[PDB]
Amino acid sequence: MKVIDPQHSDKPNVLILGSGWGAISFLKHIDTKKYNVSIISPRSYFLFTPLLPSAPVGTVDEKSIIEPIVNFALKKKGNVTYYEAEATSINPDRNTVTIKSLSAVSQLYQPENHLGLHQAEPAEIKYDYLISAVGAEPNTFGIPGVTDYGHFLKEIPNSLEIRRTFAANLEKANLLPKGDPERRRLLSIVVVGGGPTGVEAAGELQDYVHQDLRKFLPALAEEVQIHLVEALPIVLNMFEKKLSSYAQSHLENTSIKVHLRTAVAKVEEKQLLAKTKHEDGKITEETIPYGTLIWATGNKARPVITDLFKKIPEQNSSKRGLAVNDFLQVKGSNNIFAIGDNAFAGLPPTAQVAHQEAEYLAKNFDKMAQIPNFQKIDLLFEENNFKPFKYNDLGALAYLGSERAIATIRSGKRTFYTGGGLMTFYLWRILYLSMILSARSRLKVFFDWIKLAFFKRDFFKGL
Amino acid sequence: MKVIDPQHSDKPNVLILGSGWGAISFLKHIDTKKYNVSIISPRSYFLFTPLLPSAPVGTVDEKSIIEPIVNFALKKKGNVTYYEAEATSINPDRNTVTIKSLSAVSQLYQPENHLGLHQAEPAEIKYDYLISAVGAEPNTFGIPGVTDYGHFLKEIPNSLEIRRTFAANLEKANLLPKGDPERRRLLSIVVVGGGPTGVEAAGELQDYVHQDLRKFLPALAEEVQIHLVEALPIVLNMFEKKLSSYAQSHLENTSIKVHLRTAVAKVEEKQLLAKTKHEDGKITEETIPYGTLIWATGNKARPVITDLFKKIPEQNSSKRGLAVNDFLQVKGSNNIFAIGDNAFAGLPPTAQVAHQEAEYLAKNFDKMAQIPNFQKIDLLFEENNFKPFKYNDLGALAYLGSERAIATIRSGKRTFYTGGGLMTFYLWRILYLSMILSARSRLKVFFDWIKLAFFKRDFFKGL
Ligand SMILES: Cc1cc2nc3c(=O)[nH]c(=O)nc-3n(C[C@H](O)[C@H](O)[C@H](O)COP(=O)(O)OP(=O)(O)OC[C@H]3O[C@@H](n4cnc5c(N)ncnc54)[C@H](O)[C@@H]3O)c2cc1C
Ligand SMILES: Cc1cc2nc3c(=O)[nH]c(=O)nc-3n(C[C@H](O)[C@H](O)[C@H](O)COP(=O)(O)OP(=O)(O)OC[C@H]3O[C@@H](n4cnc5c(N)ncnc54)[C@H](O)[C@@H]3O)c2cc1C
Ligand SMILES: COC1=C(OC)C(=O)C(C/C=C(\C)CCC=C(C)C)=C(C)C1=O
Ligand SMILES: COC1=C(OC)C(=O)C(C/C=C(\C)CCC=C(C)C)=C(C)C1=O
């Protein structure tokens, strides 16, 4: 019950799902004069995910790396409306999306209507076109105990939980005598994932220990131990072998214990069971004690996308994400589009792919809105003549702790970069500053870093 | 049970209670080479209380106006030890202090001993001399319902509660239609207290409304209403009448409803009952609806100080604080000293009084530690010949919202200042920056303000 249908305006309604890289990038490029745009997302702000790993340890403040949606919508010319709630069910036949847990409603540049909605009231939102960018969720691979004792590294709350756990453990450990094995376990951290997120997480945690903790509790600092576990035989496999090797050496020089060729079998309250697969082809078992477990491995489709597979006939055989055209239209649907991690197009699940797809699609919509036929929809994309999406891989970046990073930079064919260590660390900072989406967030992180040069990190457990 | 008694060292032990203005100021001046210093306080950091009223609304970040104790202790030459716990009982006869709720132990410049203490374990701490600076706690004057529905404005947690309440109310109000009286109550704020803390609190809240809220929800911003209630007939009575008048005019120009000659009789869930005492000597009743109640009135002795009145014979007739000498020694005690709000010496309860008493006392201790007799204690203060404490009133300051402040600056006899409006607002900033106790906190607030010039306040309900 309750159906919101704003269409006194003669414009078509483009409904967006999410407030991440795909949704915001699309929002920034979509012509709000041609269409009435509306966003649905339980998250009232945009997260700059590449700096998330610096948040727990206080290299950057959590407020520094987020930006309210309304600030993006405010710079838009036309009307934009944000429903603070999550999409539960996508309804192709009805052309609606069901919502749950209404926390707020914002209607920018729309001084007129009144919805008449109580909080947590179920509803249905009409649409003419739908862009789906809810993203994925973390994958535990069905390995028991991960959700009970692990911390994912996906969202701002996760940064606060990791700080609270680790601060708690440091306080406890400090009361026990230098020998105690419990002291040793409480000071043990385990990051699962050999990719960029995991490496950066181990790097930042190590930075905090060597730089901040050592200055007022050197005793505790010496006994802390950080493990990095990865199933593949090479860390950061998306780079050339030469850069991966340097990466692995450096991590071990900064005293991080790297566990390659290693899968996790089970996760318990105080330890995890791992199977390591050696060069001679033999498998061994080892226990890894821990006090804080960061889970930074791959992705899995969300319940809303899974529920959509059952409804569209040709979307049956789909698991990783939604099956999509060369034009980023959802296969089998008349008007549903998909971008980012929640959409399969044989491309990686990365922020670079989300942004470029978002722009492409936004560009097309602004082109599509200059025709009588768009004012049935599938054949019109071709007749008028315009190009499909061509991803342009720009490369990869990764901070490795202790003022060192690796970089590969390119455009299509040619490659040009500086990807060693300290100088690449400086390039790394500049580029990241450059690709932050807002000026406020950019000044905030700049100040965080200036402050970090002179005074070192804030690491409060209650804040 | 369990008694910690560190005295392998030949030095006397000066035990400090608290981590506020008196304790930290004393700590910075006490010679750690002459004495073994130890702090007991449940709060692991120092709070810069004059900027606390800018925290809720995000003019300054909560992290910006606090500084961990260990940073102060680290700059000290000798040994310093901090017990993260609260003093429960002061024991003159035994010369000990009982403690509760052990969260942590820090022993800076002391790479040796091990206490062997579990968390939340009761204990007793030996001492030779004791400096008491626990401060006071808020006084509700026995007016019912204050602690049930009000927010005190005393500590960092209070800043977070006020933001959470107010953000919640704004979100709710926004869903109701422009008429609704509930909408009007949810947008109503009430600050109790005509002194500086209360005035500043009303000013900051009004700044947030006019500057930030109006830019994205002008409709809500116009209907917000802020009340200031004060029992005395004049706001900010500690200034000359001429400055108080300007203060009151300005507050009313910025659309704040000031209620003078008004006492609060009772506080309910959605309103408060007040009695106003008019010029013709008649008393009236009025209800003041509200959604957020900030209680910023006076002080009251803490249970630890009250419990000490019963034990010392001549400390019986004492209520506001501990009765104290011209040398700041506790009357009736051999070795207990009191500074700040928890000590009565016919002086105001202000930060300026705490700092000067702290220095005086610290100075004396460093002088007292160059004699055979100090190596019984009461008569030695006089025989060697040195002066009593003479407070030097430097004046008063107060921000009044909308870039205006009042100032009175002086030293003893002479008075010299600039105490009008906008120019006094600039002086106000400089002086406050100048009397922050640490460089980190000083840069942090400076950056907050630079950021505030270009981008306006962060006002997140979860952060
Ligand atoms: C810690 C970390 C670091 C990373 N670092 C990098 C990096 O350095 N470089 C790089 O290229 N890539 C990086 N990535 C990858 C990148 O963040 C993702 O690939 C990208 O966010 C995917 O874009 P998206 O819009 O599909 O999903 P997201 O950006 O995750 O956004 C999804 C949005 O949908 C919302 N949502 C969730 N569920 C629902 C629902 N049911 N209904 C409605 N809305 C919903 C969420 O609130 C969120 O705002 C990183 C990822 C992580 C976790
Ligand atoms: C919002 C606000 C604004 C203010 N502005 C000004 C101003 O502009 N100018 C001015 O001069 N004054 C101002 N004051 C007054 C000033 O903060 C106090 O007068 C001052 O704090 C008193 O110093 P103190 O050390 O006695 O107590 P505090 O500074 O309050 O410190 C008390 C310390 O004792 C600790 N403690 C409490 N109970 C126990 C216990 N049982 N055991 C151990 N430790 C304990 C606390 O954690 C705290 O660290 C302001 C106060 C407030 C609340
Ligand atoms: C998760 O692994 C990573 C990628 O994918 C496997 C990347 O591609 C890049 C390259 C950096 C990007 C794309 C920053 C985002 C830029 C914009 C314009 C949004 C990094 C650093 C990375 O760590
Ligand atoms: C509680 O009312 C207040 C006073 O007392 C009646 C003051 O005197 C001042 C003046 C500012 C001070 C004293 C800052 C404190 C500085 C140090 C070094 C402790 C302010 C602002 C004030 O609000």
CSV table of N, CA, C and O and ligand atoms in Angstrom, one decimal, chain A residues 17-23 40-43 45 49-50 52-53 85-87 133-136 153-155 197 200 302 304 339-342 349-352 354 397 432, ligand 1:
chain,number,residue,atom,x,y,z
A,17,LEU,N,19.3,3.6,-7.7
A,17,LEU,CA,19.4,2.8,-6.5
A,17,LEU,C,20.9,2.9,-6.0
A,17,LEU,O,21.8,2.4,-6.7
A,18,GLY,N,21.1,3.4,-4.9
A,18,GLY,CA,22.4,3.5,-4.2
A,18,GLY,C,23.0,4.9,-4.1
A,18,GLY,O,22.5,5.8,-4.7
A,19,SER,N,24.0,5.0,-3.3
A,19,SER,CA,24.7,6.3,-3.1
A,19,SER,C,26.3,6.2,-3.1
A,19,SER,O,27.0,6.9,-2.4
A,20,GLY,N,26.7,5.2,-4.0
A,20,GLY,CA,28.2,4.9,-4.1
A,20,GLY,C,28.7,5.5,-5.4
A,20,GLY,O,28.3,6.5,-6.0
A,21,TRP,N,29.7,4.8,-6.0
A,21,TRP,CA,30.5,5.3,-7.1
A,21,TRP,C,29.7,5.4,-8.4
A,21,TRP,O,29.8,6.4,-9.1
A,22,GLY,N,28.9,4.4,-8.7
A,22,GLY,CA,28.0,4.4,-9.8
A,22,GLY,C,26.9,5.4,-9.8
A,22,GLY,O,26.7,6.2,-10.7
A,23,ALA,N,26.2,5.5,-8.7
A,23,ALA,CA,25.0,6.3,-8.5
A,23,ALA,C,25.4,7.8,-8.5
A,23,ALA,O,24.8,8.6,-9.2
A,40,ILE,N,17.3,6.3,-4.2
A,40,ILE,CA,16.9,5.4,-3.1
A,40,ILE,C,18.2,4.8,-2.5
A,40,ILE,O,18.9,4.1,-3.3
A,41,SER,N,18.5,5.0,-1.2
A,41,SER,CA,19.6,4.4,-0.6
A,41,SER,C,19.5,4.5,0.9
A,41,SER,O,19.0,5.5,1.4
A,42,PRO,N,19.9,3.5,1.7
A,42,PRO,CA,19.8,3.6,3.1
A,42,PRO,C,20.9,4.5,3.7
A,42,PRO,O,20.8,4.8,4.8
A,43,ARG,N,21.9,4.8,2.8
A,43,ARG,CA,23.1,5.6,3.2
A,43,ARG,C,23.0,7.0,2.7
A,43,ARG,O,23.0,7.3,1.5
A,45,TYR,N,25.0,9.4,2.5
A,45,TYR,CA,26.2,10.0,2.1
A,45,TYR,C,27.0,9.1,1.2
A,45,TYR,O,26.8,7.9,1.1
A,49,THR,N,35.8,5.1,-0.9
A,49,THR,CA,36.3,3.8,-0.5
A,49,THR,C,37.8,3.6,-0.5
A,49,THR,O,38.3,2.9,0.3
A,50,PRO,N,38.6,4.2,-1.4
A,50,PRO,CA,40.0,4.0,-1.4
A,50,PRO,C,40.8,4.5,-0.2
A,50,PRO,O,41.8,3.9,0.1
A,52,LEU,N,39.3,4.4,2.9
A,52,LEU,CA,38.6,3.8,4.0
A,52,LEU,C,39.7,3.1,4.9
A,52,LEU,O,39.6,3.2,6.1
A,53,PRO,N,40.6,2.4,4.3
A,53,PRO,CA,41.6,1.7,5.2
A,53,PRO,C,42.4,2.5,6.1
A,53,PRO,O,43.1,2.0,7.0
A,85,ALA,N,16.2,5.0,2.5
A,85,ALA,CA,15.6,3.7,2.7
A,85,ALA,C,16.3,2.7,1.8
A,85,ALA,O,16.9,3.1,0.8
A,86,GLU,N,16.1,1.4,2.1
A,86,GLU,CA,16.7,0.4,1.2
A,86,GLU,C,15.7,-0.3,0.3
A,86,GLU,O,14.5,-0.4,0.6
A,87,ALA,N,16.1,-0.6,-0.9
A,87,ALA,CA,15.3,-1.3,-1.9
A,87,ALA,C,15.2,-2.7,-1.4
A,87,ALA,O,16.2,-3.4,-1.2
A,133,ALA,N,22.6,0.4,-9.1
A,133,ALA,CA,24.0,0.4,-8.6
A,133,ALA,C,24.1,0.2,-7.1
A,133,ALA,O,24.7,1.0,-6.4
A,134,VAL,N,23.4,-0.8,-6.6
A,134,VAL,CA,23.5,-1.1,-5.2
A,134,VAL,C,24.8,-1.7,-4.7
A,134,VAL,O,25.1,-1.7,-3.5
A,135,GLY,N,25.6,-2.1,-5.7
A,135,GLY,CA,26.9,-2.7,-5.4
A,135,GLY,C,26.8,-4.1,-4.8
A,135,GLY,O,25.7,-4.6,-4.7
A,136,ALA,N,27.9,-4.7,-4.5
A,136,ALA,CA,27.9,-6.1,-3.9
A,136,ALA,C,28.1,-6.0,-2.4
A,136,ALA,O,28.1,-4.9,-1.8
A,153,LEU,N,35.6,-4.8,6.0
A,153,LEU,CA,36.1,-3.5,5.8
A,153,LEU,C,35.4,-2.9,4.7
A,153,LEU,O,36.1,-2.6,3.6
A,154,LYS,N,34.1,-2.6,4.8
A,154,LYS,CA,33.3,-2.2,3.8
A,154,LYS,C,32.7,-0.8,4.0
A,154,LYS,O,32.5,0.0,3.0
A,155,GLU,N,32.3,-0.4,5.2
A,155,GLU,CA,31.6,0.8,5.5
A,155,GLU,C,32.1,1.5,6.7
A,155,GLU,O,32.8,1.0,7.5
A,197,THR,N,43.0,-3.7,-0.8
A,197,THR,CA,42.3,-3.4,0.4
A,197,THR,C,43.0,-4.0,1.6
A,197,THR,O,43.3,-3.3,2.6
A,200,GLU,N,46.7,-2.5,2.1
A,200,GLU,CA,46.6,-1.2,2.7
A,200,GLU,C,46.2,-1.2,4.2
A,200,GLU,O,46.7,-0.4,5.0
A,302,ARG,N,23.8,-9.0,-3.9
A,302,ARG,CA,22.9,-8.7,-2.8
A,302,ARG,C,21.5,-9.4,-3.0
A,302,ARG,O,21.1,-9.7,-4.1
A,304,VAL,N,18.6,-8.3,-3.2
A,304,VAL,CA,17.7,-7.6,-4.1
A,304,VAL,C,18.0,-8.0,-5.6
A,304,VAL,O,17.1,-8.1,-6.4
A,339,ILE,N,24.9,-0.7,-13.5
A,339,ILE,CA,26.3,-0.3,-13.5
A,339,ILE,C,27.0,-0.6,-12.2
A,339,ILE,O,26.3,-0.7,-11.1
A,340,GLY,N,28.3,-0.8,-12.2
A,340,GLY,CA,29.1,-1.1,-11.0
A,340,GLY,C,29.2,-2.6,-10.7
A,340,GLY,O,29.1,-3.5,-11.5
A,341,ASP,N,29.5,-2.8,-9.4
A,341,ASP,CA,29.7,-4.2,-8.9
A,341,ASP,C,28.4,-5.1,-9.0
A,341,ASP,O,28.6,-6.3,-9.1
A,342,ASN,N,27.2,-4.5,-9.0
A,342,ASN,CA,26.0,-5.3,-9.1
A,342,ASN,C,25.6,-5.6,-10.5
A,342,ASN,O,24.5,-6.1,-10.8
A,349,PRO,N,35.5,-5.7,-10.6
A,349,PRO,CA,34.6,-5.0,-9.6
A,349,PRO,C,35.4,-3.9,-9.0
A,349,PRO,O,35.9,-4.1,-7.8
A,350,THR,N,35.6,-2.8,-9.7
A,350,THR,CA,36.5,-1.7,-9.2
A,350,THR,C,35.8,-0.3,-9.4
A,350,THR,O,34.9,-0.2,-10.3
A,351,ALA,N,36.3,0.7,-8.6
A,351,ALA,CA,35.7,2.0,-8.7
A,351,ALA,C,35.9,2.7,-10.1
A,351,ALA,O,35.1,3.4,-10.5
A,352,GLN,N,37.0,2.3,-10.7
A,352,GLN,CA,37.3,2.9,-12.1
A,352,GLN,C,36.2,2.4,-13.1
A,352,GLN,O,35.8,3.2,-13.9
A,354,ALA,N,33.1,1.5,-12.4
A,354,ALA,CA,31.8,2.1,-12.0
A,354,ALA,C,31.7,3.5,-12.5
A,354,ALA,O,30.6,3.9,-13.0
A,397,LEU,N,46.8,1.3,-8.3
A,397,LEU,CA,47.6,2.0,-7.3
A,397,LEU,C,47.5,1.2,-5.9
A,397,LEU,O,46.5,0.5,-5.7
A,432,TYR,N,45.2,10.5,-5.5
A,432,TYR,CA,44.1,10.3,-4.7
A,432,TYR,C,43.4,11.6,-4.3
A,432,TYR,O,42.1,11.7,-4.5
C,1,LIG,C1,37.9,-0.8,1.5
C,1,LIG,C2,37.8,-0.7,0.0
C,1,LIG,C3,38.8,-0.1,-0.7
C,1,LIG,C4,38.7,0.1,-2.1
C,1,LIG,N1,39.6,0.7,-2.8
C,1,LIG,C5,39.6,0.9,-4.1
C,1,LIG,C6,40.6,1.6,-4.8
C,1,LIG,O1,41.6,2.0,-4.2
C,1,LIG,N2,40.5,1.7,-6.2
C,1,LIG,C7,39.5,1.2,-6.8
C,1,LIG,O2,39.5,1.4,-8.1
C,1,LIG,N3,38.5,0.5,-6.2
C,1,LIG,C8,38.4,0.3,-4.9
C,1,LIG,N4,37.4,-0.4,-4.2
C,1,LIG,C9,36.3,-0.9,-5.0
C,1,LIG,C10,35.1,0.1,-5.1
C,1,LIG,O3,34.9,0.7,-3.8
C,1,LIG,C11,33.8,-0.6,-5.6
C,1,LIG,O4,34.1,-1.5,-6.7
C,1,LIG,C12,32.7,0.4,-6.0
C,1,LIG,O5,32.3,1.0,-4.8
C,1,LIG,C13,31.5,-0.3,-6.7
C,1,LIG,O6,30.6,0.7,-7.1
C,1,LIG,P1,29.0,0.5,-6.9
C,1,LIG,O7,28.4,1.9,-7.0
C,1,LIG,O8,28.6,-0.7,-7.7
C,1,LIG,O9,28.9,0.1,-5.3
C,1,LIG,P2,29.3,1.0,-4.1
C,1,LIG,O10,30.2,2.1,-4.5
C,1,LIG,O11,29.6,0.0,-3.0
C,1,LIG,O12,27.9,1.7,-3.7
C,1,LIG,C14,26.7,0.9,-3.5
C,1,LIG,C15,25.7,1.8,-2.8
C,1,LIG,O13,24.4,1.2,-2.7
C,1,LIG,C16,23.9,1.3,-1.4
C,1,LIG,N5,23.0,0.1,-1.2
C,1,LIG,C17,23.4,-1.1,-0.6
C,1,LIG,N6,22.4,-2.0,-0.6
C,1,LIG,C18,21.3,-1.3,-1.1
C,1,LIG,C19,19.9,-1.7,-1.3
C,1,LIG,N7,19.4,-2.9,-1.0
C,1,LIG,N8,19.1,-0.7,-1.8
C,1,LIG,C20,19.6,0.5,-2.2
C,1,LIG,N9,20.8,0.8,-2.0
C,1,LIG,C21,21.8,0.0,-1.5
C,1,LIG,C22,25.0,1.5,-0.5
C,1,LIG,O14,24.7,2.3,0.6
C,1,LIG,C23,26.1,2.2,-1.4
C,1,LIG,O15,26.1,3.6,-1.3
C,1,LIG,C24,37.5,-0.5,-2.8
C,1,LIG,C25,36.5,-1.2,-2.1
C,1,LIG,C26,36.6,-1.3,-0.7
C,1,LIG,C27,35.6,-2.0,0.1
